[PDB]
UniProtKB/Swiss-Prot annotation, chain C:
Residues engaged in binding hydrogencarbonate: Q135, T136, G137
Protein name, per record: 1,4-dihydroxy-2-naphthoyl-CoA synthase
Family: Belongs to the enoyl-CoA hydratase/isomerase family. MenB subfamily.
Site (Important for catalysis): Y239
Top-level enzyme category: lyase
Summary of the function given for this chain in its UniProt record: Converts o-succinylbenzoyl-CoA (OSB-CoA) to 1,4-dihydroxy-2-naphthoyl-CoA (DHNA-CoA).
Any one GO cellular component localisation term in the record: cytosol
EC number from the UniProt entry: 4.1.3.36
InterPro entries named among the record's database cross-references: ClpP/crotonase-like_dom_sf, DHNA-CoA_synthase_MenB, Enoyl-CoA_hyd/isom_CS, Enoyl-CoA_hydra/iso, Enoyl-CoA_hydra_C
Entries under SUPFAM superfamilies matching the protein: ClpP/crotonase (SSF52096)
Record organism: Salmonella typhimurium (strain LT2 / SGSC1412 / ATCC 700720)
Cofactor: hydrogencarbonate
Swiss-Prot record, chain D:
Catalysis performed (reactions): 2-succinylbenzoyl-CoA + H(+) = 1,4-dihydroxy-2-naphthoyl-CoA + H2O
Enzyme Commission code(s) on record: 4.1.3.36
Binding positions (substrate): R41, A80, G81, G82, D83, Y108, S109, I110, G111, G112, T134, S140, Y237
Organism, as annotated: Salmonella typhimurium (strain LT2 / SGSC1412 / ATCC 700720)
InterPro entries hit by this protein: ClpP/crotonase-like_dom_sf, DHNA-CoA_synthase_MenB, Enoyl-CoA_hyd/isom_CS, Enoyl-CoA_hydra/iso, Enoyl-CoA_hydra_C
Cofactor(s) listed in the protein's UniProt record: hydrogencarbonate
Pfam family, one: ECH_1
Record-given protein name: 1,4-dihydroxy-2-naphthoyl-CoA synthase
Keywords: Lyase, Menaquinone biosynthesis
One GO CC term, this protein: cytosol
Annotated metabolic or biological route of this protein: Quinol/quinone metabolism; 1,4-dihydroxy-2-naphthoate biosynthesis; 1,4-dihydroxy-2-naphthoate from chorismate: step 6/7; Quinol/quinone metabolism; menaquinone biosynthesis
UniProt: hydrogencarbonate binding residues: Q133, T134, G135
Summary of the function given for this chain in its UniProt record: Converts o-succinylbenzoyl-CoA (OSB-CoA) to 1,4-dihydroxy-2-naphthoyl-CoA (DHNA-CoA).
Length: 262, 264, 266, 239, 262, 264
C-alpha cells in the first residue's frame, strides 16, 4: 500500500524528436509530458502545443499508460502563458485517461487554463495562479471561463478574470481550485502516489466517470463521449455480439432470445 | 416481412382489477393500455391515472413485453384530457420507461390527453385524429414537457401557436408539422400500429433502451444523464472487467484491474 | 426559539410490514427512514430499496409530514452501499429528487459507494464528527455516472468531484465540511438533536415555498425534467387563483370562459 | 364566432412624440408597433430601436393590452434590416415580454429584420413575404438568438443553410420549413393577423404568460428559469 | 498608492427620490439605495430609479465599473404589486460593465439576491446575509436559486433557502458567497481599489468575459450576449469593415481578399 | 452570377499517400474528401477514418480552402457505414472545423455513414439517395450526436422513429423531414453542390466560422462556448484594443486601455 505508493519511480525517456518538451513513461503506467522552456517560465509557443498534442495522442493510444502528468521543467514554473492551444484543451478534455497537472511555481494565463483543464491539480507550496487576459488585452471565454466557474464558483471566477491578480497555493486550495498542496520537494512523490492510486482502479470505470463529469458541462459533445463509452461497453456484451455473430453465422439476428430488464 | 408484420394479432386480457382502463398483452411482446371511458371521450380521472401507472409499471417489469401501446376505447377519442397533478408522475414514467411507448390515436387527443400522446415515443394517427391544447381556454396550462418537449417536436413557432390559440388540428396538419409519425385509415389504425411495434420488436431491446435514454438526454439534463449513465452501468456489469469486483469479493481477494487493457 | 428547537422529540413507529428499514413519524411533522442492517454497515439490498421507495412515497403523501430524515441504524454507518446487479436504486434516487419535501441525510459513520450517492441526493446533510465519506466504484469495478457524478460536481466543484471518483479515498467530517459536501459537523452524541433542530427551522417555513424552491434548485440541473416540476407547481398555484378557477366555474356553470375582467399585468 | 373574429378593427393613435414608428391600440386589446420608414424598406436605425423599446414597454404596462403586433409600414417591407447595437436590447424585451408578440410580415424581412420576426412568438406572412439573412454577404452576423433560436424553429440543417448562403426565401418556403405560422393574401394580412390576436385575447392572459415563459425556458437556461419563477411568485401572491 | 488615492464623487442624484447616484472622475458610478429608515428595502419606485441610473452608467462612456450599495453602515438592502426588481436583476446581469456590491450590514431577502447578481461582492466585517422568503411564503426561484447554487454549491444553496438563517461576514466568505471581508472603516477604499484594478484592464475583455461567464448559466440568452460582443468585435476588424468600405467605395464586397485561418 | 456558380470546376489532386480516400482541391477554394471503397459501398474502416482525419486537418490549415465537401466514390453510395470508434474523433473534427462541411450524397448514407452526413453542416442529396440507421437491427447504436443532434434536425418524434425502426428513407422523405437541404438530379449532383459551395465562398469566412460556432453552441454546452469564445478572442486580436497588449510589450511599456471607449 503506502510503501508501494511511495516506491521510487523510474522514468523511461521518449523525448527523441521533440524540441520544446520532454516525454517520459514509467513501467507502472504513468506518462509525463514536461514543458521544457524554463528560460521563459515554460510559456508555450505553437510548436510546443503541436508537440504536446502528439505526446498526449501517444499516451492515449499506449495501452500500458493509464494516467498522464502534465508539468513544467524546473521548480519555478508550470507554464507562464502562450492558438492551436484550443485543440490541446479539447484533447485533454476528451482523453479517456486521467490527466494530472503537477504545478510548481507559476501557472498563469493560458498556462493557468491548462492546469484547470486537467482532471486534477497537485500543487507545490510555491505555486502561483492567475489569469492575465484583461491586463494584456486578451481573454479565454471558453473553458477558461465557464469551466473555472464550475470549479471555484461564479463570484470567484469573476474576481479571477476581472482583476487578474495572482493567488498563492493556499488561496488556490481554499477556493477548491487545486486538489492538494504539498512541499516542493515532495511534489513528484505525491503526484506519483495519486497516479498510482488511480492505476489500481478500473480503467473502464475512470473513463466512463470522466465522460460523465464532462457531460455535465459539454452538452451534446459530452453526450457523444458518454454514449461512445456505452457503445464500446455494448460491443463487449453477448447481445451486442449477436449482431456480428449474425454475419459470421449468416442469418437473421435474433434478439428475442435476450432478456429485457426493467 | 409484411406477411409477418401484418400477421394477425392475438391479444390476451389482463384487465382484472381495473375499472377505468383495459390492459392486454399480445403473444409477441406488445402491451396495450386502453383508456376505457368513451362516454366522456376517454378523459382521465385520478383513478384512471393511478391505474395507468400500475399497468405501465407492469409492462416495464414484464420480461415478455418489448413495446407498449397507449390508446383510447373506440374510434372517436384517444383522450380528451383531464376529466372536466398525478398525471405528472405518469408522464415521467412514460419518459423513463426503457421500452418504446406508442400512442395509437383515433379521434380526439386534446389537452392533458394531447400531452400524453406527445410523451409517447411515437404516434400513429387515424385520418380522423384531432389534436390540440385547451389550457389557456379553460384557464390552465402544462409548462413542463407539454411545452418544452412539444417545441423539440414541431419547433418554437408552431409550439407557441398550438398553446397560445388552442386551435384543433386535423391529421394532415399534425403530420405536416411533424407532430405524429404517420396517418392511416381509421380501419387500419391497429394493424398499422402493430406493424410498427413488430418492426421495433425485431431490434435489440438494449439498443432501444440506450437510444431512448440518449434522446431523452438531449432534453433532461442530469435526469437524462442518470438514465443514460444507468444504462452504461448495466452494460459494464455484463463485461469481464465489470465483473472483476464481484468475482474478487466472492473469492475473498483484492480486485486486480491490471488484467484488463486500456483502450484509447 | 432555542427551547422550541431543542425540545424533546416524540417518535412514533410506523415500521409494520418493513424488514430492512425502520419508519417513524414525529408529532411535529418529521418523518424518519432508517436503514436497519447495521451488521453490514447498513448496506442496501433490493428489498431495502423497494422499502425506502414505499416509505418515501408514504411521507410524500402524508399531509402531516413536512420534512424527511434519511439515516442508518446505530452510530457506525449511514450506508456502506449496495449489498452482495439490479438497479432499482436509480428509481429511489429520482424519488428523493422529485420529492416536494426537504430530505435531510443524518450521517453517523460511513457513507460510502451507493450510500454516498444517497446522502448527496438528499437536500442537506448533517454529519457527526465520526462521519466518513467516499465512493468505491472504480476501486471495485463499477460507477454512478448519473447524479452521482454530475450532481456531485454541482456540490463540490469539478476538481474535487474528479478526485473523489478517480481515487476512491475516504474523507473525514472536516474534509467533507471544508469542501461543501455536508452542511454541518456536530458531535456524534448530538446528531439527532441538531438534525431535529434543522428540521424544525425548515418546518417554520411555508411548505409551498420549500416545494417551489426545491424544484427551482433541481431545475438548474435537470433540464426539461426540472421544468416539469417547476411548471407543475405553477399549475398548482394557478388553480388556487380566481383566474385559474374561472375555467372550472364556466364549466360548472356551462357557459363560456370570460377572462375579460382579469388584468393583463406587466 | 368568426363574426367576432373578423369584425372591423379600430385603431386609436398613440404616435405622439415618435418619429420612426407609428404606435396604435385597439380597444379590444391589441397594440401595434409599425416601423414607419418605407422609403428604406422599413430598415431600423438607432432612433427607431429606442422608439420601439419605448412603445413595447408602454404596451407591456398597459393592462388593457393583451397582444402586440410588430409590422412595417406599407406592403413592400416588414423590415429590411439595420441601417450602436441597441437592437439586442429590443430582441430581449420582445423575448421577456409577458404578452404574445406577433410579427405581421408583408414583403421583405431581411437581415436584422429577419431576426426580429423570428423573435416574435408568431409570424403571420403575406403571399409576397420574402425572408433571409445577409450578414455573411455584408461581413457581419447575429450569432445570438438569430442563430440558436432559429435552429429551434427550422432545425440545424436549415439554419446552417439560411445563414451560410444568405439566400432569400419566399412565403411558401418559409411556411414549409416552419419559419412562419401561416401565409395569407396580402390584402387579408391585417384581417387574419387581428383574427389570430383575438383568438389569443379570448384566452387566459396568465396562462399565456406562463406558457411563453415555459417555452423560453427550454432555450434560455437560468434567464428562462427567472421568468418562470417570477411567474410562480406572481401566482403565489394570489393564494 | 494610486489604488488607495482619495476618491472624488460628483453628485448626479438630481430628480431621484429613493437613491443617490454619483460618479468619480476615475470612472466609477455608485448607485446608493437611500432609505436607511427601512434598512434600505426597495419599493417599486426605488427599482425604477435604480434601472434608470444603471442605464445612465451603461451609456456613460467615462464609466467603467458600477458600485451598488445602501446608505449608511447598517444595511445594504433588506428586501422588497409589481415585481419590477426582476427587470433590474436582468439589467445588472446584462450590463457590459462590472457591477460590484459593497455590503455593510444587512443583505437580506430580495436584497440578498441583489448582491448575488452583482459580479463581485465586497463585504464589511459587520455584513449579514440570507434569504427570508419561505419565512413569509414567497420565494425567488430564478437567479435567486439557480445562480446562488453556481456560487456556493447545491447543498449550501438548499440550506440557505430552506432554513432562512442569517450568516455573518466570515461565514459568507468561507462559502464563497462574497469575494472579500474588510473592516467597516475600509469598506469604501477597498471597494474603490478593486474597481480601479478593473478600470486598468481592457473594457472589451471584461465585457466579453462577463458574457462568457453568464453564458455558462443563461442558455441562448447568454449566447445572445456573447455573440453580440463577437458582432461588435467583428465591426472593428478589417474584414468586418469590408461591407461599409465596399459601399463607400461604390463597389461589391470582396472577401476573397481575407485569409481563412484554421 | 449564375454563370459563375455553374462555371466548370478544376480539381487538383492531393491524394498522394492515401489508400482509402481521394483528396482534391479546386482553385476557387473547395476541398473535397472522397471515400474511395465503392466495392463495399464506401464503408469506412479504421484506416479510412485516420485518412479522413488527416485530410480534414489539411483542409483546415489550407488558407486557400474555404469549404469542404465529403462524398463517396461513384453514384451508388456516400457511405454504407462501418466495415473501431475512431470515427468519433472524426465526428468531433467535422463539428469544430471552422469551415463549412457539405455532405454530397449519392445513393446510400446508412448507419455510421448516416451520422457522417448528419454531422456535415449541409447535405446535398441526389434523387437516388437513401438514408437510415441500422444500429438496433445489428445490436449497435450511436447515442451521441447520432441521437441528440439528429433530434435538433428532424425533431424528437422523427428521430425516435428513425432509430427505433431502422427503416430506409428516400431522398424526398429526407427532404420533407428536413434531414437534407436539397434534392437534385443525380447527373447534376456535382454541379449543384459546387454552386452551393461557391455561394458560401462569396461570403465572409470569419462570419461563417462565427455562425457555425454559434449554431454548435446551441447544442454543445461549454464545448460550444469554447469554440464561440475562441472566435471572439481571434476577432479581438484583430482590433486596436486587442493590439494594445501586444504593442505594449513590443513598445516596451505597460499596456494602457484608457484610450478605448466603454461602450454600452
Amino acid at each position: 500500500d503506502e510503501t508501494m505508493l511511495y516506491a521510487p519511480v523510474e522514468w523511461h525517456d521518449c523525448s527523441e524528436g521533440y524540441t520544446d518538451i520532454r516525454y517520459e513513461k514509467s513501467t507502472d503506467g504513468i506518462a509525463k509530458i514536461t514543458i521544457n522552456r524554463p528560460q521563459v517560465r515554460n510559456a508555450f509557443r505553437p510548436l510546443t502545443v503541436k508537440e504536446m498534442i502528439q505526446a498526449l495522442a501517444d499516451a492515449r493510444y499506449d495501452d500500458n499508460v493509464g494516467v498522464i502528468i502534465l508539468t513544467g521543467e524546473g521548480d519555478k514554473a508550470f507554464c507562464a502563458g502562450g492558438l492551436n492551444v484550443l485543440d490541446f484543451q479539447r484533447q485533454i478534455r476528451t482523453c479517456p485517461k486521467p490527466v494530472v497537472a503537477m504545478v510548481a511555481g507559476y501557472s498563469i494565463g493560458g498556462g493557468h487554463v491548462l492546469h484547470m483543464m486537467c482532471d486534477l491539480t497537485i500543487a507545490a507550496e510555491n505555486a502561483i495562479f492567475g489569469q492575465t487576459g484583461p491586463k494584456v488585452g486578451s481573454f479565454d471565454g471558453g473553458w477558461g471561463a465557464s469551466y473555472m466557474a464550475r470549479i471555484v464558483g461564479q463570484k470567484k471566477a469573476r474576481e479571477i478574470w476581472f482583476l487578474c491578480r495572482q493567488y498563492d497555493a493556499q488561496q488556490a486550495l481554499d477556493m477548491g481550485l487545486v486538489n492538494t498542496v504539498v512541499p516542493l520537494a515532495d511534489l513528484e512523490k505525491e503526484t506519483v502516489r495519486w497516479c498510482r492510486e488511480m492505476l489500481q482502479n478500473s480503467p473502464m470505470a475512470l473513463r466512463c466517470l470522466k465522460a460523465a463529469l464532462n457531460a455535465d458541462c459539454d452538452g451534446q459533445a459530452g453526450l457523444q463521449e458518454l454514449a461512445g463509452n456505452a457503445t464500446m461497453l455494448f460491443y463487449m456484451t453477448e447481445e451486442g455480439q449477436e449482431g456480428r455473430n449474425a454475419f459470421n453465422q449468416k442469418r437473421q439476428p435474433d434478439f428475442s432470445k435476450f432478456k429485457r430488464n426493467p
